Amino acid sequence: MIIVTGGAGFIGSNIVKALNDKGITDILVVDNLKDGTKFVNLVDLNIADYMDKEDFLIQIMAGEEFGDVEAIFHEGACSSTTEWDGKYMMDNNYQYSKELLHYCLEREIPFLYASSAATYGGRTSDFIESREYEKPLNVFGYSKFLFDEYVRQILPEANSQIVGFRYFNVYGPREGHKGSMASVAFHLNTQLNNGESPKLFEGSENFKRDFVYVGDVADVNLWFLENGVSGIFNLGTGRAESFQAVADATLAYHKKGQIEYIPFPDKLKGRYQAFTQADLTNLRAAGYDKPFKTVAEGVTEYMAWLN
Ligand SMILES: NC(=O)c1ccc[n+]([C@@H]2O[C@H](COP(=O)([O-])OP(=O)(O)OC[C@H]3O[C@@H](n4cnc5c(N)ncnc54)[C@H](OP(=O)(O)O)[C@@H]3O)[C@@H](O)[C@H]2O)c1
Numbered sequence: 001m002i003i004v005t006g007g008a009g010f011i012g013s014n015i016v017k018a019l020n021d022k023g024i025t026d027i028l029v030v031d032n033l034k035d036g037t038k039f040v041n042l043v044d045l046n047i048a049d050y051m052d053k054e055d056f057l058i059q060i061m062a063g064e065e066f067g068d069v070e071a072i073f074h075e076g077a078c079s080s081t082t083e084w085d086g087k088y089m090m091d092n093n094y095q096y097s098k099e100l101l102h103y104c105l106e107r108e109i110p111f112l113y114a115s116s117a118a119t120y121g122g123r124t125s126d127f128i129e130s131r132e133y134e135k136p137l138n139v140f141g142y143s144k145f146l147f148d149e150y151v152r153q154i155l156p157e158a159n160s161q162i163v164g165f166r167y168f169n170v171y172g173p174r175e176g177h178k179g180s181m182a183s184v185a186f187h188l189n190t191q192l193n194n195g196e197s198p199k200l201f202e203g204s205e206n207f208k209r210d211f212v213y214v215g216d217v218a219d220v221n222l223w224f225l226e227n228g229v230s231g232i233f234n235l236g237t238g239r240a241e242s243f244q245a246v247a248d249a250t251l252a253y254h255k256k257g258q259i260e261y262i263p264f265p266d267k268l269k270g271r272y273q274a275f276t277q278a279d280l281t282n283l284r285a286a287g288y289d290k291p292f293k294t295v296a297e298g299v300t301e302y303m304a305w306l307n
């Protein structure tokens with residue numbers, strides 16, 4: 001069996017789908033369904049069982065066996081960059097991930113987890129997977145950073161696979177529950193379908209991100225499970241594109257709309273990455289040689305799915 005935490009969430013449900021496509025259905029999903037609308041992310045998929053994140057943690061820490069576990073994809077986390085309860089954040093993200101890591105380590109279970117490009121903080125180049133390039137701008141980012149640092153202390157003596165994926169700006173199907181944390185592409189689609197003006201933050205001209213399609217993210221995850229390589233790896237296209245480019249691809253699909261620029265949100269000031277671009281050197285050197293969908297490709301495919 002395979003365990004996917006955050007499996008009812010965006011990236012996690014996409015990993016579940018990718019597993020299904022390879023004929024794998026013996027899957028335990030661990031998540032938090034408090035927001036019950038997330039069920040749609042699993043409704044068309046095939047899994048073996050569901051467990052709440054709190055029950056899972058209790059059983060993990062008690063040393064319960066879940067069967068013959070082939071791997072844990074740990075996508076489960078508080079994913080909100082605007083959540084400032086750091087007690088909860090360090091607990092639900094950092095500490096939770098440590099407990100799971102040690103559980104897998106004791107049993108030689110491959111452990112593939114979610115990092116974040118938020119760890120890089122404010123930066124105009126050299127998004128490289130090393131401590132000197134890392135300086136997160138929020139506590140979410142810190143929770144991710146500190147766990148990556150913890151993993152680095154553990155790697156040299158791990159006897160089983162440990163892989164962290166430093167996701168950049170992931171977008172695509174199954175993120176409709178994320179609200180304000182959903183991709184700009186999703187927000188633009190929603191706005192256009194509601195007869196509202198599509199909205200970008202003021203200054204978005206000069207804002208760029210490495211937007212990466214969730215389908216590719218899932219593919220990378222499965223490739224690493226198949227190939228057994230350990231480490232911490234950037235996961236993006238390696239190309240930075242403006243939010244305008246995402247808007248252009250979205251408006252082109254809808255064949256209507258005019259971007260309205262809104263005030264830059266106050267709670268994001270001093271907390272915002274104006275630029276990201278994955279350096280894929282280490283990812284390629286690991287053996288992952290597949291191309292990534294561009295914004296034009298991915299967003300167009302995404303809009304077709306959404307509509
Ligand atoms: N999507 C992106 O652009 C992006 C970029 C970089 C990194 N990431 C990371 O990738 C992972 C998945 O992101 P996502 O976009 O899929 O977000 P998501 O849709 O919110 O998926 C996370 C899911 O996990 C649940 N959860 C929270 N803590 C958990 C835990 N300890 N164990 C199991 N489940 C838990 C969440 O519920 P509750 O929060 O309500 O408890 C939510 O349903 C996260 O670690 C996120 O930080 C995502």
Ligand SMILES: Nc1ncnc2c1ncn2[C@@H]1O[C@H](COP(=O)(O)OP(=O)(O)O[C@@H]2O[C@H](CO)[C@@H](O)[C@H](O)[C@@H]2O)[C@@H](O)[C@H]1O
Pocket residue numbers: 078079080081082116117118168169178180181182183184187199200201204207243268272273
């Ligand atoms: N330029 C522009 N225009 C309109 N809306 C924008 C925008 N930039 C960002 N947004 C919206 O605000 C949400 C939060 O901004 P960020 O703090 O920069 O969050 P991210 O863009 O990095 O997206 C988050 O990434 C982390 C991974 O690090 C995930 O865990 C989160 O779930 C988010 O996906 C944006 O979501 C956007 O809607």
